[PDB]
Design a binder for this molecule. Structure first.
Ligand SMILES: [N+]
Length: 52
């Protein structure tokens, strides 16, 4: 499956997954998010949820 815009529910789940796995295991994190691949999770984290 392929998803486009992120929902608030997905963002919340991503926050919890990064807390569990850390910001380097993107492939494992993506396995828990339907329709998402590792790079999408990485970009959502660095650009929107945890900006510099
Ligand atoms: N996925």
């Amino acid at each position: 499956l392929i998803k486009g815009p992120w929902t608030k529910e997905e963002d919340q789940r991503l926050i919890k997954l990064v807390q569990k796995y850390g910001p380097k295991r993107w492939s494992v994190i993506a396995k828990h998010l339907k329709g998402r691949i590792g790079k999408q999770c990485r970009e959502r984290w660095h650009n929107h949820l945890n900006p510099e």
